[model samples]
Target chain A: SMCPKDWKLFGSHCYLVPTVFSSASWNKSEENCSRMGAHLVVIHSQEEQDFITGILDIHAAYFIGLWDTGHRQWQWVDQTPYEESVTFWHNGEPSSDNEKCVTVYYRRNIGWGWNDISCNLKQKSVCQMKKI
Target chain B: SMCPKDWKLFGSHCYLVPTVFSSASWNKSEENCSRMGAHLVVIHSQEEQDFITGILDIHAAYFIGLWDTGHRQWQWVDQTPYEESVTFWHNGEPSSDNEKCVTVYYRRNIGWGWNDISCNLKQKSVCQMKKI
Candidate 1:
């Protein structure tokens, strides 16, 4: 098969760009993804949820699609609600202590721990999308 | 008039965030702006065109909305074309040298001169828009 790899052919026209970063603010990370014609990865199913966690299992800390802005309410970059079962938060995580965004920590063996951080802080990220 | 300054409300909608940077890829700069609910500042008028140049007049170098991924033709982020009179370029500029993006330099006293550069190279930028 000599067909070119079609990156944008998921069920609804989806593609993925697995990326690594030294560090970047949430905004900067999102911007990086957008340049590639996509946005921060938004986990929408148990399968996807598990797949992302699995990837983080190997890589160090990586950015996910979660931010609260000012409220403790978690929302995706596309403003979708956070699913409890799919969201991997450590005990007493999202500590209700004025946290705005969350990222994963696995290098410390924290296993998908959530930390409230300034959105502008830099970090590595992933991008995902469904074709329009 | 001591009223709080309001953004996102100029004609259809507009605001500006003046910024400075050592260097950043254009995509990175664009992502930085989007995180702020905006995009690259688009030059739409002689007045705006002159204003932007005035700022670059002090900054050593800066990025603008002009890229020709493979066309050797200019287009803005919103897909607008370069205006002949408003576009400031050095003689023999856009030399059809397979350049994909452009930036400006004033530190060289080039005074709003243009040079093709890699879009991903880090550079300072400005953001602008109309309310959406």
Candidate 2:
């Protein structure tokens, strides 16, 4: 039952979604969450997705806990691996443009809705902290 | 919390592989899984496929959760949408065969390929289901 202001409950975790912000680069945002003992959001199951969608507006962008730091390829921030989830891309996300950082995603389909952008690029991030 | 006798567990899903029956056709096998609240094998993530391969004998025929209902196109038993996902087929799969059912698939690439077959033929099967 403990959480910060505006914290939203989902499953067993508390999220700071719907927290509108002017936006921050992926790294800055990551640091912000770390300072708060949280990290960007990382989705696991369909229910988790439902929880996310339940909170978002018709269309909005939120940075998620995902990226390919080594220029290898994108995956969950926790390195949960991108094997079983979904195409997880939006029309050419990570478009081989040589950029990094990932997003919460929005597209016609949940099919790989993640996107890749420069880490320094500012954007709204979905901070997440697990509850024990 | 338990799968059938020989079934194997993977994440939130369970798989029954190479369970030879010397026998039943595609539809027959589909019915087989339903009786237990299960369905023909359906793969979503590459890791799941790798896990399946990790336990596989490299290659073999195992009826899976894919078929062309009404000759429409291959789709999951739960109708998980066949579009956007990996073609998930053997190189020469669904080869204009007039068949309407799918198989566990074994061929090139991550290679856990699937194929189309006549619903009247018998073959070994793979079954899967989600855990509560």
Candidate 3:
């Protein structure tokens, strides 16, 4: 709503990305963002992904709101449909069953893209909220 | 050569874009950059084009190095072979015989793309130099 101070305005939403030095597990980051009245960022378009990647710290991985529930069916934490949304997964990624949480990170020579990682791993995170 | 102050570094080159308020004809812009030991930007790849577009003012048109040399054959001011270089022409662009100069500008719903304009038209421009 208010977008708060220090949050970035893009499109119709406000985004919050913690500094690279501060990190938390995927679930904990999600909870932290929820407490701040936002959700872990859910990317739905190429432009949106580009905006997120542009504002990110290239050396640090940031958790997004995507994960495989069981098999390989990925879902967003905000309930956005996976099939209808744009995805930027890295080549040969989302490769392991144990790695359900998805992260956006920069790959040297390959640019920014997503990868599946363990949910328990601590990392930087991005939060999004609708601008009302 | 060392990248001069106020220039942006990307890849192996340094870029200089004049403020949007400054406008010049294509030939004049080329000469202006030449005076500064640079040339109007010659885009060779998608990444290079993206870098140029990212630094541009969305509301202002910027002249690039590509233009038709009479007949529909295009060339760059820096002698870069146009056929081998990446081009981002807008849909149905490069259409007019009289409009030979190419410019890069933001188009709503189309993002950044190149368009053919008259060489006599004044526009903002981008300059590039090798960073040795």
Docking class of 3: incorrect
> First chain of model 3: TM-score?
0.93
lDDT of 2 by residue, B50-120 (tens): 77766766546667777775654455676432433345666666686488887665565555776678778
Give each model's clash number: 20, 8, 1
Off by over 4 Å in 3: A1-132
> Candidate 3 has which clashing residue pairs, if any?
B1-B132
What is the C-alpha lDDT profile of model 3 across B1-132, one tens digit per residue?
357999998765789996643899999998888988899998766778899999998998999988787677676775433432347888888789889899999999879988999999899999997664
Model 1, A13-52: lDDT tens per residue?
Answer: 2444454556787888888877777777775554454555
DockQ of each: 0.01, 0.01, 0.01
TM-score of every prediction relative to native: 0.45, 0.51, 0.49
Error of 2 at A71 (Å): 41
Q: lDDT for model 1, on a 0 to 1 scale? A: 0.60
Q: lDDT (CA) for every model shown?
A: 0.60, 0.66, 0.82
TM-score of 2: 0.51
Clashing residue pairs in candidate 2, if any?
A24-A122, A24-A123, A83-B46, A84-B45, A87-A112, A88-A112, A89-A112, B105-B113
Interface RMSD of each: 14.2, 14.2, 21.6
**In model 2, what lDDT does residue A132 have?**
43
